């Protein structure tokens, strides 16, 4: 009776389309936010503090052409992947603190084998494990299709650690970052439109790196205006500054909770 069933959003790489991918990212955003908290037109993610554990997580079920299924657990507060589940085994990133350690105990309670990596899920660490930086790692339906397969086979013993790290960077950007950023989502749609694999450019990468900063700048903003500008990059890697909220609205879909409204 007890174990909590978290919302499940299904997506499959098999015969995937721009439409079905857009529908996927919207459903994920739908589950991550009620949309109850909005500052400057941007939906805010639920406050981690005081958050009941039944509202804490959502599940992403991934399927590919190979007919393999892999389930990801996403933290509703940061919209980030805390770990995943394949068959009878579950795997979790090393938690950043004892409360998060406690939280993930409510996940994947029906698996036989439960594992916690010695490493966390941040890009830097994941990049060291993969042996490749995000700028050298391709994104698209192909890679995601490949990432799904590698996640599944890791229990098998059929996936090398670097490959597993590579697949995480793939999954995380193509799902979490897509959900956080309409722009990033838009960059993934473009890969699907053209059936291309491409590693993300500086414009995408600095969005990922600045996400926390932007949420803060937006929530602390005075009538939309920043105290200090934030530097971002054009697709060509050239810098440019954002002094205010209006410019970010088409860009960032979700904000981490910083201050109360």
């Amino acid at each position, epitope marked *: 009776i007890f174990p909590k069933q978290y919302p499940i959003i299904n997506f499959t790489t098999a015969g995937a389309t721009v439409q079905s991918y857009t529908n996927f990212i919207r459903a994920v955003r739908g589950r991550l936010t009620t949309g109850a908290d909005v500052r400057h037109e941007i939906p805010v993610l639920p406050n981690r503090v005081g958050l009941p554990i039944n509202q804490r997580f959502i599940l992403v079920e991934l399927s590919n052409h190979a007919e393999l299924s892999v389930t990801l657990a996403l933290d509703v507060t940061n919209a980030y992947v805390v770990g995943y589940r394949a068959g009878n*085994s579950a795997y*979790f990133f*090393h*938690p950043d*603190n*004892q409360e998060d*350690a*406690e939280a*993930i*105990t409510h996940l994947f*309670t029906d*698996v*036989q*084998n*439960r*594992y*916690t*990596f*010695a*490493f966390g899920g941040n890009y830097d660490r994941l990049e060291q494990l993969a042996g490749n930086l995000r700028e050298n790692i391709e994104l698209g339906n192909g890679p995601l299709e490949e990432a799904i397969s590698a996640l599944y086979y890791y*229990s098998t*013993g059929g996936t090398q*650690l670097p490959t597993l790290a590579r697949s995480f960077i793939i999954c995380i950007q193509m799902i979490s970052e897509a959900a956080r950023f309409q722009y990033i989502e838009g960059e993934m749609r473009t890969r699907i439109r053209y059936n291309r694999r491409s590693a993300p450019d500086p414009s995408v990468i600095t969005l990922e790196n600045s996400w926390g900063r932007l949420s803060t700048a937006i929530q602390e903003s005075n009538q939309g205006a920043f105290a200090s500008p934030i530097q971002l990059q054009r697709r060509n890697g050239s810098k440019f500054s954002v002094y205010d909220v209006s410019i970010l609205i088409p860009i960032i879909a979700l904000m981490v909770y910083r201050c109360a409204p």
Partner: nanobody
Amino acid sequence: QVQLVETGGGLVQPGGSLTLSCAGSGGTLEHYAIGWFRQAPGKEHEWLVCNRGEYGSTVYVDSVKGRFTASRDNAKNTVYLQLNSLKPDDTGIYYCVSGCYSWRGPWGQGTQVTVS
């Protein structure tokens, strides 16, 4: 499939030492974190150590800090917990799992430690 078997449990006297072994079988635990928990009668499981890598530094709960020591022999594929200066309140069954600071999931038989 990697699994863990605890060993080293015994009966000890106050101030004594003991050495527990968490042995992996069907693969490397090298990149897995390994926690140690203990349960005492009429009491809930409590977390003792978090051993990461290699990788991260090793975390101890304050009460066992400097008393208890974790180490790894890679290729022996085992995580050790060396218990030192044991008190009767260190009594209980000791479990090793891959996880830290909080656990439900299977333990595990554990290996018994009695200090009298």
